[PDB]
Amino acid sequence: IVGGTNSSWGEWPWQVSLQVKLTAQRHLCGGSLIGHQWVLTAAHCFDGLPLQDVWRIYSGILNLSDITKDTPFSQIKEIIIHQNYKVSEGNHDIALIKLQAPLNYTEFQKPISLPSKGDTSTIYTNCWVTGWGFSKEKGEIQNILQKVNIPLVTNEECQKRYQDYKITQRMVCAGYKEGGKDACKGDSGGPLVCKHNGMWRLVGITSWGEGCARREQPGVYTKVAEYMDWILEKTQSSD
């Protein structure tokens, strides 16, 4: 996260860190707990290995440097990548992770609310993006979970900034014209959440953009509302 600030405990209790351990352990992506055994993230987080014994999923963690050998983590039972995701194209950048065991809910480990299958965001005037990603282009992972407040931008205005692609109704864009606040490398798969009437809810999944926090280059997010039929079908079927 570029231009953000350090979060406090309980602000973002759905945020998870998706890490891999081979010989060394590293944070690769964000994710959102959406149910007691389900995490929602980006499909592109799995380009590279989908052999899921490598993954360690940390929840209830605000500061990564706080992680030790004894810190509990979740393992992966199943990975469900959207059947129409193609890495080169970038459409349908969404994936579900089923955990090997359900998690007990606490003030620091709770699911984010999901939108209904057909909303518009114009009530979403207060949106935030979180993660442990770089604080600048060619930066490094941040220890304390970062938060940043970013305005949503219309797909028409987003499309102007990206003539090379492809801005569909299944994407949502957010950013500042002057730049300086944005998601960045390591923030993939994490939440774009908006607060409405005192309830938070998941509007987007951090996906792509040109560089980080550049002027007139907003962040592009998978629009969760447009995949709610898919999310319901896959999780009900698997359960």
Binding site: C29, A42, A183, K185, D187, T206, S207, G209
Partner: peptide
């Protein structure tokens, strides 16, 4: 995965 995506190795 392409340059525009945010995974570390994209």
């Amino acid at each position: 995965c392409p340059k525009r995506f945010a995974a570390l190795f994209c």
